[PDB]
Design a binder for this molecule. Sequence first.
Ligand SMILES: [Mg+2]
Ligand SMILES: [Mg+2]
Ligand SMILES: [Mg+2]
Ligand SMILES: [Mg+2]
Ligand SMILES: [Mg+2]
Ligand SMILES: [Mg+2]
Ligand SMILES: [Mg+2]
Ligand SMILES: [Mg+2]
Ligand SMILES: [Mg+2]
Ligand SMILES: [Mg+2]
Ligand SMILES: [Mg+2]
Ligand SMILES: [Mg+2]
Ligand SMILES: [Mg+2]
Ligand SMILES: [Mg+2]
Ligand SMILES: [Mg+2]
Ligand SMILES: [Mg+2]
Ligand SMILES: [Mg+2]
Ligand SMILES: [Mg+2]
Ligand SMILES: [Mg+2]
Ligand SMILES: [Mg+2]
Ligand SMILES: [Mg+2]
Ligand SMILES: [Mg+2]
Ligand SMILES: [Mg+2]
Ligand SMILES: [Mg+2]
Ligand SMILES: [Mg+2]
Ligand SMILES: [Mg+2]
Ligand SMILES: [Mg+2]
Ligand SMILES: [Mg+2]
Ligand SMILES: [Mg+2]
Ligand SMILES: [Mg+2]
Ligand SMILES: [Mg+2]
Ligand SMILES: [Mg+2]
Ligand SMILES: [Mg+2]
Ligand SMILES: [Mg+2]
Ligand SMILES: [Mg+2]
Ligand SMILES: [Mg+2]
Ligand SMILES: [Mg+2]
Ligand SMILES: [Mg+2]
Ligand SMILES: [Mg+2]
Ligand SMILES: [Mg+2]
Ligand SMILES: [Mg+2]
Ligand SMILES: [Mg+2]
Ligand SMILES: [Mg+2]
Ligand SMILES: [Mg+2]
Ligand SMILES: [Mg+2]
Ligand SMILES: [Mg+2]
Ligand SMILES: [Mg+2]
Ligand SMILES: [Mg+2]
Ligand SMILES: [Mg+2]
Ligand SMILES: [Mg+2]
Ligand SMILES: [Mg+2]
Ligand SMILES: [Mg+2]
Ligand SMILES: [Mg+2]
Ligand SMILES: [Mg+2]
Ligand SMILES: [Mg+2]
Ligand SMILES: [Mg+2]
Ligand SMILES: [Mg+2]
Ligand SMILES: [Mg+2]
Ligand SMILES: [Mg+2]
Ligand SMILES: [Mg+2]
Ligand SMILES: [Mg+2]
Ligand SMILES: [Mg+2]
Ligand SMILES: [Mg+2]
Ligand SMILES: [Mg+2]
Ligand SMILES: [Mg+2]
Ligand SMILES: [Mg+2]
Ligand SMILES: [Mg+2]
Ligand SMILES: [Mg+2]
Ligand SMILES: [Mg+2]
Ligand SMILES: [Mg+2]
Ligand SMILES: [Mg+2]
Ligand SMILES: [Mg+2]
Ligand SMILES: [Mg+2]
Ligand SMILES: [Mg+2]
Ligand SMILES: [Mg+2]
Ligand SMILES: [Mg+2]
Ligand SMILES: [Mg+2]
Ligand SMILES: [Mg+2]
Ligand SMILES: [Mg+2]
Ligand SMILES: [Mg+2]
Ligand SMILES: [Mg+2]
Ligand SMILES: [Mg+2]
Ligand SMILES: [Mg+2]
Ligand SMILES: [Mg+2]
Ligand SMILES: [Mg+2]
Ligand SMILES: [Mg+2]
Ligand SMILES: [Mg+2]
Ligand SMILES: [Mg+2]
Ligand SMILES: [Mg+2]
Ligand SMILES: [Mg+2]
Ligand SMILES: [Mg+2]
Ligand SMILES: [Mg+2]
Ligand SMILES: [Mg+2]
Ligand SMILES: [Mg+2]
Ligand SMILES: [Mg+2]
Ligand SMILES: [Mg+2]
Ligand SMILES: [Mg+2]
Ligand SMILES: [Mg+2]
Ligand SMILES: [Mg+2]
Ligand SMILES: [Mg+2]
Ligand SMILES: [Mg+2]
Ligand SMILES: [Mg+2]
Ligand SMILES: [Mg+2]
Ligand SMILES: [Mg+2]
Ligand SMILES: [Mg+2]
Ligand SMILES: [Mg+2]
Ligand SMILES: [Mg+2]
Ligand SMILES: [Mg+2]
Ligand SMILES: [Mg+2]
Ligand SMILES: [Mg+2]
Ligand SMILES: [Mg+2]
Ligand SMILES: [Mg+2]
Ligand SMILES: [Mg+2]
Ligand SMILES: [Mg+2]
Ligand SMILES: [Mg+2]
Ligand SMILES: [Mg+2]
Ligand SMILES: [Mg+2]
Ligand SMILES: [Mg+2]
Ligand SMILES: [Mg+2]
Ligand SMILES: [Mg+2]
Ligand SMILES: [Mg+2]
Ligand SMILES: [Mg+2]
Ligand SMILES: [Mg+2]
Lengths: 137, 52, 154, 117, 112, 101
Amino acid sequence: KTYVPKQVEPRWVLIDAEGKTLGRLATKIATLLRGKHRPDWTPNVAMGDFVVVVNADKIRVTGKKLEQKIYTRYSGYPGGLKKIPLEKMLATHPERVLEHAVKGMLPKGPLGRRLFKRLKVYAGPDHPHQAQRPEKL
Amino acid sequence: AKHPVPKKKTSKARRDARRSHHALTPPILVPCPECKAMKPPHTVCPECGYYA
Amino acid sequence: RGEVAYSGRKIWPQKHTGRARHGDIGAPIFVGGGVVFGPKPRDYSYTLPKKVRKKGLAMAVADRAREGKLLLVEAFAGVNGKTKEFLAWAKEAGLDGSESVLLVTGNELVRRAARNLPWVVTLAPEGLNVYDIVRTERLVMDLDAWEVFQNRIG
Amino acid sequence: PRAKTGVVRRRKHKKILKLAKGYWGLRSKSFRKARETLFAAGNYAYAHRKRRKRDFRRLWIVRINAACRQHGLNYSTFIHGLKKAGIEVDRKNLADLAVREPQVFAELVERAKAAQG
Amino acid sequence: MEAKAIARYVRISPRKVRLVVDLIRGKSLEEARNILRYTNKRGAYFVAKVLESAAANAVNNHDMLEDRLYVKAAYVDEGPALKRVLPRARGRADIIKKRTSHITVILGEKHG
Amino acid sequence: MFAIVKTGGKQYRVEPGLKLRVEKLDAEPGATVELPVLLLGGEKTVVGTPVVEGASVVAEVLGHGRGKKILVSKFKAKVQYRRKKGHRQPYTELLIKEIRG
RNA sequence: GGCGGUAGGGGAGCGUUCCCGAUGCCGAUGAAGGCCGACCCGCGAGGGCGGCUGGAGGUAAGGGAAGUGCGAAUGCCGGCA
RNA sequence: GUGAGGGCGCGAGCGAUAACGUCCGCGUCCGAGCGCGGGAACAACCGAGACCGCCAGCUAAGGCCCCCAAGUCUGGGCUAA
RNA sequence: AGUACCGUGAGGGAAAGGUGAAAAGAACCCCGGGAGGGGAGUGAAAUAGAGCCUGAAACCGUGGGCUUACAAGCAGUCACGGCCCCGCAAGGGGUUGUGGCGUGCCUAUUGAAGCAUGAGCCGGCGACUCACGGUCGUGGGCGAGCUUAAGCCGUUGAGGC
Ligand SMILES: [Mg+2]
Ligand SMILES: [Mg+2]
Ligand SMILES: [Mg+2]
Ligand SMILES: [Mg+2]
Ligand SMILES: [Mg+2]
Ligand SMILES: [Mg+2]
Ligand SMILES: [Mg+2]
Ligand SMILES: [Mg+2]
Ligand SMILES: [Mg+2]
Ligand SMILES: [Mg+2]
Ligand SMILES: [Mg+2]
Ligand SMILES: [Mg+2]
Ligand SMILES: [Mg+2]
Ligand SMILES: [Mg+2]
Ligand SMILES: [Mg+2]
Ligand SMILES: [Mg+2]
Ligand SMILES: [Mg+2]
Ligand SMILES: [Mg+2]
Ligand SMILES: [Mg+2]
Ligand SMILES: [Mg+2]
Ligand SMILES: [Mg+2]
Ligand SMILES: [Mg+2]
Ligand SMILES: [Mg+2]
Ligand SMILES: [Mg+2]
Ligand SMILES: [Mg+2]
Ligand SMILES: [Mg+2]
Ligand SMILES: [Mg+2]
Ligand SMILES: [Mg+2]
Ligand SMILES: [Mg+2]
Ligand SMILES: [Mg+2]
Ligand SMILES: [Mg+2]
Ligand SMILES: [Mg+2]
Ligand SMILES: [Mg+2]
Ligand SMILES: [Mg+2]
Ligand SMILES: [Mg+2]
Ligand SMILES: [Mg+2]
Ligand SMILES: [Mg+2]
Ligand SMILES: [Mg+2]
Ligand SMILES: [Mg+2]
Ligand SMILES: [Mg+2]
Ligand SMILES: [Mg+2]
Ligand SMILES: [Mg+2]
Ligand SMILES: [Mg+2]
Ligand SMILES: [Mg+2]
Ligand SMILES: [Mg+2]
Ligand SMILES: [Mg+2]
Ligand SMILES: [Mg+2]
Ligand SMILES: [Mg+2]
Ligand SMILES: [Mg+2]
Ligand SMILES: [Mg+2]
Ligand SMILES: [Mg+2]
Ligand SMILES: [Mg+2]
Ligand SMILES: [Mg+2]
Ligand SMILES: [Mg+2]
Ligand SMILES: [Mg+2]
Ligand SMILES: [Mg+2]
Ligand SMILES: [Mg+2]
Ligand SMILES: [Mg+2]
Ligand SMILES: [Mg+2]
Ligand SMILES: [Mg+2]
Ligand SMILES: [Mg+2]
Ligand SMILES: [Mg+2]
Ligand SMILES: [Mg+2]
Ligand SMILES: [Mg+2]
Ligand SMILES: [Mg+2]
Ligand SMILES: [Mg+2]
Ligand SMILES: [Mg+2]
Ligand SMILES: [Mg+2]
Ligand SMILES: [Mg+2]
Ligand SMILES: [Mg+2]
Ligand SMILES: [Mg+2]
Ligand SMILES: [Mg+2]
Ligand SMILES: [Mg+2]
Ligand SMILES: [Mg+2]
Ligand SMILES: [Mg+2]
Ligand SMILES: [Mg+2]
Ligand SMILES: [Mg+2]
Ligand SMILES: [Mg+2]
Ligand SMILES: [Mg+2]
Ligand SMILES: [Mg+2]
Ligand SMILES: [Mg+2]
Ligand SMILES: [Mg+2]
Ligand SMILES: [Mg+2]
Ligand SMILES: [Mg+2]
Ligand SMILES: [Mg+2]
Ligand SMILES: [Mg+2]
Ligand SMILES: [Mg+2]
Ligand SMILES: [Mg+2]
Ligand SMILES: [Mg+2]
Ligand SMILES: [Mg+2]
Ligand SMILES: [Mg+2]
Ligand SMILES: [Mg+2]
Ligand SMILES: [Mg+2]
Ligand SMILES: [Mg+2]
Ligand SMILES: [Mg+2]
Ligand SMILES: [Mg+2]
Ligand SMILES: [Mg+2]
Ligand SMILES: [Mg+2]
Ligand SMILES: [Mg+2]
Ligand SMILES: [Mg+2]
Ligand SMILES: [Mg+2]
Ligand SMILES: [Mg+2]
Ligand SMILES: [Mg+2]
Ligand SMILES: [Mg+2]
Ligand SMILES: [Mg+2]
Ligand SMILES: [Mg+2]
Ligand SMILES: [Mg+2]
Ligand SMILES: [Mg+2]
Ligand SMILES: [Mg+2]
Ligand SMILES: [Mg+2]
Ligand SMILES: [Mg+2]
Ligand SMILES: [Mg+2]
Ligand SMILES: [Mg+2]
Ligand SMILES: [Mg+2]
Ligand SMILES: [Mg+2]
Ligand SMILES: [Mg+2]
Ligand SMILES: [Mg+2]
Ligand SMILES: [Mg+2]
Ligand SMILES: [Mg+2]
Ligand SMILES: [Mg+2]
Ligand SMILES: [Mg+2]
Ligand SMILES: [Mg+2]
Ligand SMILES: [Mg+2]
C-alpha cells in the first residue's frame, strides 16, 4: 500500500522578489506552497512549506501591465464594480499584487486557503524575525 | 390556499433547527425573610406574608 | 366490476376539481371495487384419447407387476366385513402393512375389510384408474377382476 | 386461488432499505428515496473504481516526479532513461523508494543518468 | 434503583409540555418542585402532578428517601390524537388535531 | 532485503518472509513455488535486464480462497435498464519464505 | 473468440397463493410472521444458518393450477408529517 | 416493434449565396453509447464501442508554467498589440 | 347494516372482527379531583391489563458513540487519516476531517437535472385474463385412418359404454 505520511514539521523558506517576474515567482511560491516539491507529497493532509517573500515592490512586470493590468473588486452593491489599475496597488498595499497572484494559483479547495496562510509577504526586506530563514532563488 | 404557499416540506432537520431558541427559561426565585420558601424577586408570597 | 352493489353515478365532475378522475366506485382501482380479472367458475376437464386411457392402464398394472408387486389372489377366507379377518388374511398373504395396497375385488364384503384399513384402498374392478394404481406400493386384485381387466385390455 | 401480496414487497423493501441505511433524512428511511440514492451510488462505485486506478497512477508520479526532481531532472527525463535502459523494474507504484531506501532510488536515478548517455 | 410514574392520556400537546419537562431534566426533587411552583405554563400543572406522585412511589414502594432523590431522567410521549371538524368559509371542513400526551417522569437515588 | 517480484500482472516488494496476498495461482494447497521474477534487493540489486538474471524469490502457497464480494451495479436513466451483478476475486496466500537472489 | 443498448424477439431462473406428494413428515426442546446480522451458498432475483421476539401452526424431493412480485396512474383506502 | 426524427459533413431546391430555418439525396454520430477521455462546462465536433476484477503496463484526442497529469524541453524565425 | 350518515325526493351508502386454557378481568395500600400510574395479588406469559395476539413502516421521543459555527450542495462514491466499538492477530464494524469525481427517479421526447409531467411520507388495493373458434410451434397416442357429441351405466373426488 502506497506510503502513508505522518506529522511533519513546518519547513520555512525565505524567498527574494527583486527583479523577479511576478508570474514566474508566484508559480514556484505556489508549487512549493504545498509540499508538491517534496517526494512525500499528499493532497489530503496539506503539509506545505511556510513560504515568506520579501521585497514585494521590487517585482518586475512586462509590457504595458503597470498601465494595462486591471484588478476587479465587486461589492454586492449596484455599480460597485470598483476596479483598480496595477500601479495603484503598488502605491497602496503593494504586497497584495503577489498575494492575489499566488492566491489565484493555490487550489480552490478549503485547504488551499489553509495554504494561503503559509504565505507571508512584505517589502523591506525584514521579516518577522522568528527562526527559520532558508534563503532560496 | 392563496398566493402565500410553502414550496417544499421543510426538512425535519431544518424544523428542529428553527426551534433552536424556542427552549424555555427557568423562573427566578430567592429565599425570603419569613420562611425558607422561594419567593419571586420583589414580591410577597402566600403562606409567608410581608412587612410595611 | 359488473356484479357489484355500488352505484353507477360519477363521483366527481372530472373538471376544475383538483381531484384525480373517476366514474363510479365499481372501478377496480377502488379498494372494494370489482375484481379485475378474477377467475369465474368453469370446468377444468377435457377428453383424453381412449387409446391412451387403456395404454396407461396397461403400462400401469404392467409396471407394478414388472417391479414384482402384482399379486393375483382368489382365496378370501374373509367370511364377512370384519377387518380382523382381512388383516389375518393379508398377514398370511404377505402384506404386513409395510406397503400400501390397492385392493381390486368384485365382492363388496372384501371392501368392508380393507375399507377402513389405512394402509390399503378398496376399489371396484372397473375402478382401475391410473392414479390410485401408481399411488400405492402394492397391487392385489381378484382373479375374476383380472378377467374384466383383460376385457378392457388383455 | 387468491395470492395476497403477503410478505414479498415489505421484505424487498426492508432489504434494500438497509443497504442504504446511513444516508440523509428521507434519503435513508423512505423505501424509495433510498433506491434512487442507491441507483446513483451504484454507478458512482463503477466509475470511481476505474478512477481509483487513475488516482494512484498520477498520485505516484507526483511523488516520483518530485523525487528525481530533487536529484535534478524531469519525470519525462527520468522514465525515458529507464524505459531505454530496459527496466520495467520500478513500476510507477514501487517508485515510492524515494521514501523507503532513498539510496536505492538514487542508484536508479544514476542508472537513468548514464542510461540516456 | 429508580421510580417511574407515567400519566397516560392527558389532553395537551406534547410540544407544549416538552418544554416543561426539559426544565427539570436531572434536577433535585425540591429544585424541580420550585421550578413548577412558579413557572408560567399550563404544562406545569401536569408535569408537576406526575413528578410529585413519582416521589410517592419512590418512597412507599422502593425504600427511597425523599431527601435524596433527583431526576435520573424524564420525557413526554405523544399519544392518540382526537381528530375534530372545523367549519370553514365556502363550506370547507378541516380536521383540528387535539393531540394528547404520555408524561413519563422517573427518579433515582443520588450518590454515596 | 527489498526484493520486488511481478506476478498476476502486478508487482510489489517482498519483506524477508512475511504474509502476502497475490493473484490466484495453479499450485497445490500447502506447497512451495518459485518466482524467478525478481527486481532489486536489499543491497542494491541493479536489475540489468528488465528482470534480474540469476535470482529467485520463493514462497509457500498458504492456500487459496475467494475474498470480499464487491457488488457492481449499472443504471441508466429515462430507460428501464438496471443491472445488478455480483462479483468476487480469488487469490492465494503466498507466505514469503526464501529471498535468495 | 463474441458479450453498451430503448422499442423488439428469443432463452434460463427466482419468489408468492393453492393442489397431488399427506391416514405422511417438521413442530412448544417453540409453526407462520416480526426484529438483527460484518457468517454461508447463488451472477442474480433468492436460498440457508445463528441470536431475539413470537405462541400453533407449517409443509421437502418431483410434479400440477394461478386473483402471482408496484414507485409512480393529480390512481384507491388508511395512518402520520 | 417502427411509420414526429435530429445534429453534422457533402451535393441541390426554397430562403435573402438569412435563421439551433426548411425540403430531398450520399454518408456519419445521437437516437438507444446523457458510458468513458478531450473540447471550461455541452445528445450528436475530436478520441474511443464499457462482460466483471486489479493501488500493473504502452498509447489515442488533447496536453505537458500554477489551479492540473506530465518539458518553465531543444534548436531556428516572426509578433509589442 | 341497507344501519350511521348524505339527499326535498327517487336514490346514495360507510366504517367497524380477535385478552386469556380458565375471568382467575386485578382485592388492600400509595400519589392523584379524576384519568392515570406505582407496589402487591392472578396467569406459563401482563411490552396477554382490557378496540388487550402477533405487532412491521412513515411519524414523535429519551440516553449513548462519532461528527459539526471560514463554510458552495442530487448529498453520494473512491482514498487517506483521527475517534469509538467487536477479534489473540491479521481483520471487521459504526462515524467523517481533508483530497478526488459527480447534473435526482418516472414519463414524455429529435432532445431533460431541467424553469415540461406525476409523486408529502409510509403501509395495504391496483392493470394482459377466461370461454368458444382459428393459426404456428411443441410433447405424446394412434395411422389411412383419427376422434367421439348429447346422453346412458357406474361411483360419491373410479371409469366405461
Ligand atoms: Mg508612461
Ligand atoms: Mg506615469
Ligand atoms: Mg445612483
Ligand atoms: Mg458611488
Ligand atoms: Mg467540493
Ligand atoms: Mg430531532
Ligand atoms: Mg428544549
Ligand atoms: Mg353494475
Ligand atoms: Mg349495482
Ligand atoms: Mg346499492
Ligand atoms: Mg354502472
Ligand atoms: Mg351499476
Ligand atoms: Mg355507468
Ligand atoms: Mg350513467
Ligand atoms: Mg379539464
Ligand atoms: Mg371486491
Ligand atoms: Mg366487495
Ligand atoms: Mg371485497
Ligand atoms: Mg376448459
Ligand atoms: Mg383450455
Ligand atoms: Mg381443446
Ligand atoms: Mg382406506
Ligand atoms: Mg399485490
Ligand atoms: Mg419493489
Ligand atoms: Mg455502511
Ligand atoms: Mg487501465
Ligand atoms: Mg527524498
Ligand atoms: Mg380540563
Ligand atoms: Mg405501600
Ligand atoms: Mg395504543
Ligand atoms: Mg372561519
Ligand atoms: Mg394537519
Ligand atoms: Mg543475494
Ligand atoms: Mg447485450
Ligand atoms: Mg452487441
Ligand atoms: Mg421457474
Ligand atoms: Mg388428505
Ligand atoms: Mg402460509
Ligand atoms: Mg421463520
Ligand atoms: Mg441474503
Ligand atoms: Mg435458521
Ligand atoms: Mg415465549
Ligand atoms: Mg423465528
Ligand atoms: Mg400442501
Ligand atoms: Mg390482483
Ligand atoms: Mg415502476
Ligand atoms: Mg401511491
Ligand atoms: Mg397536488
Ligand atoms: Mg394530494
Ligand atoms: Mg389519503
Ligand atoms: Mg402516419
Ligand atoms: Mg443547401
Ligand atoms: Mg422543423
Ligand atoms: Mg432541421
Ligand atoms: Mg441523416
Ligand atoms: Mg446506439
Ligand atoms: Mg446504431
Ligand atoms: Mg451506434
Ligand atoms: Mg443522468
Ligand atoms: Mg469533457
Ligand atoms: Mg463529454
Ligand atoms: Mg478486462
Ligand atoms: Mg505510457
Ligand atoms: Mg500531442
Ligand atoms: Mg493544462
Ligand atoms: Mg525559440
Ligand atoms: Mg370480556
Ligand atoms: Mg393497577
Ligand atoms: Mg389506571
Ligand atoms: Mg383509576
Ligand atoms: Mg388507580
Ligand atoms: Mg405492568
Ligand atoms: Mg413483544
Ligand atoms: Mg401475549
Ligand atoms: Mg398494559
Ligand atoms: Mg371488555
Ligand atoms: Mg386503549
Ligand atoms: Mg398489543
Ligand atoms: Mg388474538
Ligand atoms: Mg390464541
Ligand atoms: Mg416495538
Ligand atoms: Mg399498540
Ligand atoms: Mg432525545
Ligand atoms: Mg438527543
Ligand atoms: Mg439521542
Ligand atoms: Mg475570507
Ligand atoms: Mg473550524
Ligand atoms: Mg463545489
Ligand atoms: Mg471497548
Ligand atoms: Mg479483547
Ligand atoms: Mg483487543
Ligand atoms: Mg489490524
Ligand atoms: Mg483496526
Ligand atoms: Mg477500522
Ligand atoms: Mg472504518
Ligand atoms: Mg453501529
Ligand atoms: Mg458539484
Ligand atoms: Mg405528454
Ligand atoms: Mg414536446
Ligand atoms: Mg424515441
Ligand atoms: Mg429542480
Ligand atoms: Mg420536473
Ligand atoms: Mg407546466
Ligand atoms: Mg404536456
Ligand atoms: Mg405537482
Ligand atoms: Mg395534500
Ligand atoms: Mg394528503
Ligand atoms: Mg396523499
Ligand atoms: Mg407504498
Ligand atoms: Mg402506495
Ligand atoms: Mg396484484
Ligand atoms: Mg395483478
Ligand atoms: Mg384458445
Ligand atoms: Mg393459416
Ligand atoms: Mg396443430
Ligand atoms: Mg396441438
Ligand atoms: Mg412427437
Ligand atoms: Mg406431434
Ligand atoms: Mg420426438
Ligand atoms: Mg406423433
Ligand atoms: Mg413418435
Ligand atoms: Mg372415498
Ligand atoms: Mg378435499
